[PDB]
Design a protein around this motif. Sequence first.
Motif, short mmCIF file in Angstrom:
data_model
loop_
_atom_site.label_atom_id
_atom_site.label_comp_id
_atom_site.label_asym_id
_atom_site.label_seq_id
_atom_site.Cartn_x
_atom_site.Cartn_y
_atom_site.Cartn_z
N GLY A 154 29.37 40.69 7.45
CA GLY A 154 29.84 41.30 6.23
C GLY A 154 30.42 40.29 5.26
O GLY A 154 30.52 39.10 5.53
N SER A 155 30.81 40.80 4.11
CA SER A 155 31.64 40.04 3.19
C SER A 155 33.06 40.04 3.72
O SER A 155 33.69 41.09 3.84
N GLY A 182 31.55 49.81 11.53
CA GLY A 182 30.93 48.86 10.63
C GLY A 182 29.55 48.38 11.04
O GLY A 182 28.74 48.00 10.16
N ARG A 183 29.27 48.36 12.34
CA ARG A 183 27.97 47.91 12.84
C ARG A 183 27.26 49.07 13.52
O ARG A 183 27.79 49.68 14.46
N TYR A 184 26.07 49.37 13.05
CA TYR A 184 25.29 50.51 13.54
C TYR A 184 23.86 50.07 13.83
O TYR A 184 23.40 49.01 13.36
N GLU A 217 39.02 45.90 1.40
CA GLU A 217 38.54 47.28 1.48
C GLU A 217 38.56 47.82 2.90
O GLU A 217 39.13 48.88 3.17
N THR A 218 37.96 47.11 3.85
CA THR A 218 37.81 47.69 5.19
C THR A 218 39.14 47.81 5.92
O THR A 218 39.43 48.85 6.53
N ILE A 219 39.93 46.74 5.92
CA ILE A 219 41.22 46.77 6.62
C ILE A 219 42.16 47.81 6.02
O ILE A 219 42.73 48.60 6.78
N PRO A 220 42.33 47.89 4.69
CA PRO A 220 43.09 49.03 4.13
C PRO A 220 42.58 50.39 4.59
O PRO A 220 43.39 51.28 4.89
N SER A 261 32.09 49.62 4.31
CA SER A 261 32.78 50.30 3.22
C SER A 261 33.86 51.23 3.77
O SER A 261 33.80 51.70 4.91
N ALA A 262 34.86 51.48 2.93
CA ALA A 262 35.92 52.42 3.30
C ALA A 262 35.35 53.78 3.65
O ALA A 262 35.78 54.39 4.64
N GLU A 263 34.39 54.28 2.87
CA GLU A 263 33.84 55.59 3.17
C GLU A 263 33.13 55.59 4.51
O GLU A 263 33.29 56.53 5.29
#
Length: 315
Positions: A128-129, A88-90, A136-139, A97-99
Amino acid sequence: QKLERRELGNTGLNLSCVGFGASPLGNVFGDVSEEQSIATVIEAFNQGINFFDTSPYYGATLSEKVLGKCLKALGASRDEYIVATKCGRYAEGFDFSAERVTKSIDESLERLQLEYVDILQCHDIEFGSLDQIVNETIPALQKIKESGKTRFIGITGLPLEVYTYVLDRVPPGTIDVVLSYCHYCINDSTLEDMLPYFKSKGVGVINASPLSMGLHTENGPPEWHPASPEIKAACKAAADYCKKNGKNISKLALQYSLSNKDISTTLVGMNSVKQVEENVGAALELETAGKDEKTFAEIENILKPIKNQSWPSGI
Protein backbone atom coordinates in the motif's frame (compact mmCIF):
# COMPACT_ATOMS: atom_id res chain seq x y z
CA GLN A 1 5.30 -28.35 32.63
CA LYS A 2 3.08 -25.80 30.88
CA LEU A 3 3.82 -23.93 27.67
CA GLU A 4 5.30 -20.54 28.53
CA ARG A 5 3.21 -17.39 28.04
CA ARG A 6 4.67 -13.95 27.38
CA GLU A 7 3.28 -10.46 27.84
CA LEU A 8 2.51 -8.67 24.59
CA GLY A 9 3.80 -5.06 24.79
CA ASN A 10 1.45 -2.86 26.81
CA THR A 11 -1.70 -4.77 25.86
CA GLY A 12 -1.92 -6.85 29.03
CA LEU A 13 -2.36 -9.97 26.87
CA ASN A 14 -0.31 -13.05 27.83
CA LEU A 15 0.28 -15.14 24.70
CA SER A 16 1.52 -18.69 24.46
CA CYS A 17 5.04 -18.50 23.07
CA VAL A 18 3.95 -20.74 20.20
CA GLY A 19 0.92 -19.34 18.40
CA PHE A 20 -1.47 -20.96 15.96
CA GLY A 21 -1.15 -19.62 12.43
CA ALA A 22 -4.57 -20.44 11.01
CA SER A 23 -3.71 -19.96 7.33
CA PRO A 24 -3.61 -23.76 6.70
CA LEU A 25 -7.20 -24.05 7.91
CA GLY A 26 -8.10 -22.17 4.73
CA ASN A 27 -6.63 -24.99 2.60
CA VAL A 28 -3.64 -22.76 1.76
CA PHE A 29 -1.08 -25.59 1.67
CA GLY A 30 -3.40 -28.48 0.73
CA ASP A 31 -6.91 -29.74 1.38
CA VAL A 32 -7.80 -30.21 5.07
CA SER A 33 -11.20 -31.48 6.15
CA GLU A 34 -13.25 -29.40 8.56
CA GLU A 35 -13.12 -32.30 11.02
CA GLN A 36 -9.31 -32.24 10.86
CA SER A 37 -9.07 -28.47 11.34
CA ILE A 38 -11.33 -28.64 14.39
CA ALA A 39 -9.33 -31.50 15.89
CA THR A 40 -6.08 -29.59 15.35
CA VAL A 41 -7.36 -26.43 17.03
CA ILE A 42 -8.76 -28.41 19.95
CA GLU A 43 -5.44 -30.20 20.37
CA ALA A 44 -3.52 -26.92 20.20
CA PHE A 45 -5.69 -25.35 22.89
CA ASN A 46 -5.43 -28.45 25.06
CA GLN A 47 -1.61 -28.23 24.85
CA GLY A 48 -1.68 -24.62 26.04
CA ILE A 49 -1.77 -22.57 22.83
CA ASN A 50 -4.10 -19.62 23.42
CA PHE A 51 -3.37 -17.42 20.40
CA PHE A 52 -4.92 -17.84 16.94
CA ASP A 53 -4.06 -15.62 13.97
CA THR A 54 -5.87 -15.40 10.64
CA SER A 55 -6.72 -12.98 7.81
CA PRO A 56 -9.51 -12.59 5.26
CA TYR A 57 -6.81 -13.29 2.66
CA TYR A 58 -6.08 -16.83 3.76
CA GLY A 59 -8.03 -19.19 1.57
CA ALA A 60 -10.07 -16.27 0.18
CA THR A 61 -11.96 -15.96 3.52
CA LEU A 62 -12.14 -19.72 4.18
CA SER A 63 -9.54 -19.69 6.97
CA GLU A 64 -11.67 -17.23 8.96
CA LYS A 65 -14.81 -19.28 8.45
CA VAL A 66 -13.11 -22.53 9.44
CA LEU A 67 -11.38 -20.93 12.42
CA GLY A 68 -14.75 -19.66 13.63
CA LYS A 69 -16.10 -23.21 13.63
CA CYS A 70 -12.96 -24.44 15.42
CA LEU A 71 -13.14 -21.82 18.16
CA LYS A 72 -16.78 -22.70 18.81
CA ALA A 73 -15.76 -26.35 19.05
CA LEU A 74 -13.29 -25.57 21.83
CA GLY A 75 -16.13 -25.17 24.28
CA ALA A 76 -14.09 -22.59 26.18
CA SER A 77 -14.90 -19.15 27.52
CA ARG A 78 -14.10 -16.36 25.07
CA ASP A 79 -11.49 -14.83 27.41
CA GLU A 80 -9.48 -18.12 27.43
CA TYR A 81 -8.22 -17.53 23.88
CA ILE A 82 -6.90 -14.60 21.88
CA VAL A 83 -7.89 -14.04 18.24
CA ALA A 84 -6.05 -11.86 15.75
CA THR A 85 -7.13 -11.05 12.23
CA LYS A 86 -6.18 -8.60 9.54
CA CYS A 87 -7.58 -6.20 7.02
CA GLY A 88 -6.52 -4.57 3.78
CA ARG A 89 -5.34 -7.67 1.89
CA TYR A 90 -7.91 -9.81 0.09
CA ALA A 91 -7.93 -12.50 -2.57
CA GLU A 92 -9.21 -9.72 -4.86
CA GLY A 93 -6.40 -7.29 -4.06
CA PHE A 94 -5.38 -4.60 -1.64
CA ASP A 95 -7.68 -1.94 -0.26
CA PHE A 96 -6.52 -0.03 2.81
CA SER A 97 -9.22 2.62 2.61
CA ALA A 98 -11.11 3.57 5.76
CA GLU A 99 -14.37 2.34 4.24
CA ARG A 100 -12.91 -1.04 3.29
CA VAL A 101 -11.31 -1.82 6.64
CA THR A 102 -14.38 -0.68 8.56
CA LYS A 103 -16.51 -3.07 6.51
CA SER A 104 -13.85 -5.76 6.77
CA ILE A 105 -13.99 -6.08 10.54
CA ASP A 106 -17.72 -6.76 10.36
CA GLU A 107 -17.20 -9.37 7.64
CA SER A 108 -14.47 -11.03 9.71
CA LEU A 109 -16.57 -11.06 12.88
CA GLU A 110 -19.40 -12.71 10.95
CA ARG A 111 -17.12 -15.44 9.61
CA LEU A 112 -15.33 -15.93 12.94
CA GLN A 113 -18.67 -16.05 14.85
CA LEU A 114 -17.28 -13.58 17.39
CA GLU A 115 -18.41 -10.29 18.89
CA TYR A 116 -14.83 -8.93 18.88
CA VAL A 117 -11.29 -9.87 17.96
CA ASP A 118 -8.44 -9.16 20.32
CA ILE A 119 -6.11 -7.86 17.58
CA LEU A 120 -6.76 -6.34 14.14
CA GLN A 121 -3.82 -5.50 11.91
CA CYS A 122 -3.24 -3.98 8.47
CA HIS A 123 -2.02 -6.85 6.29
CA ASP A 124 1.19 -6.54 4.21
CA ILE A 125 1.34 -2.76 4.10
CA GLU A 126 4.37 -2.74 1.80
CA PHE A 127 1.78 -3.20 -0.99
CA GLY A 128 0.00 0.00 0.00
CA SER A 129 0.76 3.66 0.22
CA LEU A 130 2.44 4.02 3.60
CA ASP A 131 1.13 7.58 3.79
CA GLN A 132 -2.40 6.20 3.39
CA ILE A 133 -1.68 3.74 6.21
CA VAL A 134 -0.59 6.62 8.43
CA ASN A 135 -3.20 9.20 7.53
CA GLU A 136 -6.26 7.06 6.71
CA THR A 137 -6.01 3.39 7.61
CA ILE A 138 -4.64 3.69 11.15
CA PRO A 139 -7.22 6.38 12.13
CA ALA A 140 -9.91 4.02 10.82
CA LEU A 141 -8.54 1.17 12.96
CA GLN A 142 -8.49 3.50 15.97
CA LYS A 143 -12.22 4.03 15.44
CA ILE A 144 -12.75 0.26 15.20
CA LYS A 145 -10.81 -0.13 18.44
CA GLU A 146 -12.99 2.57 20.04
CA SER A 147 -16.11 0.60 19.00
CA GLY A 148 -14.84 -2.51 20.81
CA LYS A 149 -14.89 -4.70 17.69
CA THR A 150 -11.12 -5.06 18.19
CA ARG A 151 -9.23 -4.52 21.41
CA PHE A 152 -5.80 -3.72 19.90
CA ILE A 153 -4.42 -2.65 16.54
CA GLY A 154 -1.31 -3.30 14.52
CA ILE A 155 0.49 -3.52 11.20
CA THR A 156 2.23 -6.32 9.31
CA GLY A 157 4.48 -6.72 6.28
CA LEU A 158 7.73 -8.23 5.18
CA PRO A 159 10.18 -5.29 4.95
CA LEU A 160 11.21 -3.97 8.35
CA GLU A 161 11.42 -0.47 6.87
CA VAL A 162 7.63 -0.27 6.79
CA TYR A 163 7.46 -0.37 10.59
CA THR A 164 9.90 2.48 11.13
CA TYR A 165 8.19 4.52 8.44
CA VAL A 166 4.74 4.14 9.94
CA LEU A 167 5.64 4.21 13.63
CA ASP A 168 7.75 7.31 13.18
CA ARG A 169 4.68 9.09 11.80
CA VAL A 170 1.89 8.22 14.24
CA PRO A 171 1.44 9.65 17.75
CA PRO A 172 3.04 7.77 20.64
CA GLY A 173 0.84 4.93 21.81
CA THR A 174 -1.15 4.49 18.59
CA ILE A 175 -0.01 0.99 17.56
CA ASP A 176 -0.32 -1.90 20.02
CA VAL A 177 1.36 -4.78 18.16
CA VAL A 178 3.24 -5.69 15.01
CA LEU A 179 3.51 -9.00 13.23
CA SER A 180 6.75 -9.65 11.37
CA TYR A 181 7.73 -12.70 9.40
CA CYS A 182 10.94 -14.25 8.05
CA HIS A 183 13.23 -11.98 10.10
CA TYR A 184 13.70 -13.95 13.28
CA CYS A 185 14.99 -17.30 12.08
CA ILE A 186 18.29 -19.08 11.74
CA ASN A 187 19.17 -17.32 8.46
CA ASP A 188 17.82 -13.82 9.30
CA SER A 189 17.67 -12.31 12.78
CA THR A 190 17.17 -8.69 11.72
CA LEU A 191 13.95 -8.43 13.79
CA GLU A 192 16.23 -8.30 16.84
CA ASP A 193 17.55 -4.95 15.60
CA MET A 194 13.99 -3.57 15.71
CA LEU A 195 13.30 -4.69 19.28
CA PRO A 196 14.81 -1.53 20.89
CA TYR A 197 12.64 0.56 18.60
CA PHE A 198 9.45 -1.41 19.36
CA LYS A 199 10.26 -1.34 23.10
CA SER A 200 10.77 2.43 23.03
CA LYS A 201 7.33 2.71 21.44
CA GLY A 202 5.56 0.23 23.71
CA VAL A 203 4.70 -2.07 20.78
CA GLY A 204 4.38 -5.81 21.27
CA VAL A 205 6.06 -8.09 18.77
CA ILE A 206 4.72 -11.24 17.09
CA ASN A 207 6.99 -13.32 14.83
CA ALA A 208 5.90 -15.75 12.13
CA SER A 209 7.42 -18.10 9.50
CA PRO A 210 10.18 -19.55 11.74
CA LEU A 211 11.00 -22.01 8.96
CA SER A 212 11.19 -19.11 6.47
CA MET A 213 8.39 -20.55 4.34
CA GLY A 214 10.04 -23.93 4.06
CA LEU A 215 13.73 -23.11 3.82
CA HIS A 216 14.37 -24.80 7.18
CA THR A 217 12.87 -28.15 6.29
CA GLU A 218 14.27 -31.41 5.03
CA ASN A 219 12.01 -31.20 1.98
CA GLY A 220 13.15 -27.65 1.24
CA PRO A 221 11.21 -24.65 0.02
CA PRO A 222 8.34 -24.68 -2.46
CA GLU A 223 9.05 -23.76 -6.08
CA TRP A 224 7.51 -20.30 -5.65
CA HIS A 225 9.73 -19.29 -2.73
CA PRO A 226 11.20 -15.86 -3.55
CA ALA A 227 14.61 -16.33 -1.90
CA SER A 228 17.71 -16.08 -4.04
CA PRO A 229 19.48 -19.26 -5.19
CA GLU A 230 22.31 -18.52 -2.75
CA ILE A 231 19.93 -18.32 0.22
CA LYS A 232 18.33 -21.57 -0.86
CA ALA A 233 21.67 -23.31 -1.29
CA ALA A 234 22.93 -22.41 2.17
CA CYS A 235 19.64 -23.38 3.83
CA LYS A 236 19.73 -26.72 2.04
CA ALA A 237 23.32 -27.18 3.28
CA ALA A 238 22.22 -26.45 6.84
CA ALA A 239 19.37 -28.96 6.53
CA ASP A 240 21.84 -31.48 5.08
CA TYR A 241 24.21 -30.98 8.00
CA CYS A 242 21.36 -31.64 10.43
CA LYS A 243 20.23 -34.74 8.50
CA LYS A 244 23.77 -36.16 8.46
CA ASN A 245 24.13 -35.61 12.23
CA GLY A 246 20.74 -37.07 13.17
CA LYS A 247 19.13 -33.75 14.02
CA ASN A 248 15.92 -32.03 12.98
CA ILE A 249 16.46 -28.76 11.10
CA SER A 250 12.85 -27.69 11.58
CA LYS A 251 12.85 -28.34 15.33
CA LEU A 252 16.11 -26.42 15.76
CA ALA A 253 14.85 -23.58 13.57
CA LEU A 254 11.71 -23.23 15.68
CA GLN A 255 13.74 -23.38 18.88
CA TYR A 256 15.97 -20.59 17.62
CA SER A 257 12.92 -18.42 16.91
CA LEU A 258 11.43 -19.12 20.36
CA SER A 259 14.61 -18.26 22.24
CA ASN A 260 14.22 -14.46 22.26
CA LYS A 261 11.87 -13.55 25.11
CA ASP A 262 11.29 -10.03 23.76
CA ILE A 263 9.25 -11.67 20.99
CA SER A 264 5.91 -12.58 22.57
CA THR A 265 4.86 -15.39 20.24
CA THR A 266 5.98 -17.21 17.13
CA LEU A 267 3.15 -18.26 14.87
CA VAL A 268 3.39 -21.72 13.32
CA GLY A 269 0.92 -23.02 10.73
CA MET A 270 -0.61 -26.33 11.83
CA ASN A 271 -3.12 -28.73 10.33
CA SER A 272 -2.53 -32.06 12.12
CA VAL A 273 -2.47 -33.19 15.73
CA LYS A 274 1.10 -34.48 15.39
CA GLN A 275 2.26 -31.03 14.26
CA VAL A 276 0.84 -29.59 17.49
CA GLU A 277 2.70 -32.14 19.58
CA GLU A 278 5.94 -31.52 17.70
CA ASN A 279 5.79 -27.73 17.96
CA VAL A 280 4.69 -27.54 21.59
CA GLY A 281 7.25 -30.21 22.48
CA ALA A 282 10.06 -28.19 20.88
CA ALA A 283 9.11 -25.22 23.03
CA LEU A 284 8.88 -27.25 26.26
CA GLU A 285 12.25 -28.88 25.62
CA LEU A 286 13.83 -25.52 24.87
CA GLU A 287 12.60 -24.13 28.20
CA THR A 288 14.26 -26.87 30.22
CA ALA A 289 17.43 -27.49 28.17
CA GLY A 290 18.21 -24.19 26.45
CA LYS A 291 19.71 -24.01 22.99
CA ASP A 292 22.07 -26.70 21.70
CA GLU A 293 24.80 -24.18 21.07
CA LYS A 294 27.34 -26.50 19.40
CA THR A 295 24.74 -27.36 16.77
CA PHE A 296 23.59 -23.76 16.34
CA ALA A 297 27.20 -22.71 15.90
CA GLU A 298 27.64 -25.14 13.02
CA ILE A 299 24.39 -23.97 11.42
CA GLU A 300 25.53 -20.37 11.82
CA ASN A 301 28.78 -21.13 10.04
CA ILE A 302 26.92 -22.66 7.07
CA LEU A 303 24.42 -19.81 6.84
CA LYS A 304 27.03 -17.05 7.36
CA PRO A 305 27.43 -16.06 3.66
CA ILE A 306 23.71 -15.25 3.34
CA LYS A 307 22.86 -14.19 6.88
CA ASN A 308 20.20 -11.47 7.02
CA GLN A 309 19.63 -11.40 3.25
CA SER A 310 16.01 -10.98 2.22
CA TRP A 311 14.04 -10.51 -1.04
CA PRO A 312 11.80 -7.85 -2.57
CA SER A 313 8.20 -7.40 -1.50
CA GLY A 314 5.54 -4.82 -2.27
CA ILE A 315 5.62 -1.61 -4.26
